[PDB]
Amino acid sequence: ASYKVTLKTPDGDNVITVPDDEYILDVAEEEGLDLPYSCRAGACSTCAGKLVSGPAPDEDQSFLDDDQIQAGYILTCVAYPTGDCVIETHKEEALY
C-alpha cells in the first residue's frame, strides 16, 4: 500500500513512498524527479533501475525486455514496488 522506496540518483538519495498500484517513476516524476525514459512501456532500456535492497517490484508488465529482472534489473516505467526498497536509477550502462 505505500512502500518507502529510496532511489540513489545522480544527485543524492531521495526517498519517495509509492502506493503498490503506482509505477515507481509515476511517483518519482510527481515528486519532481527524473529518471530517463522513452516508451513509457517497458519496451526498452532507458528507464532501467537496479534493485539495491528490497523485494522486487512486480515487473510482470514491462517485458519483451531481455529476461534479467533477476540481476536485480528492474524497469521503472512499469514497476510496482512490493515493499520497502533501494534502487540505483540511471541504469543502461549495464544492460547495454
Ligand code: FES
Ligand atoms: S522507458 Fe522504455 S522500458 Fe521504460
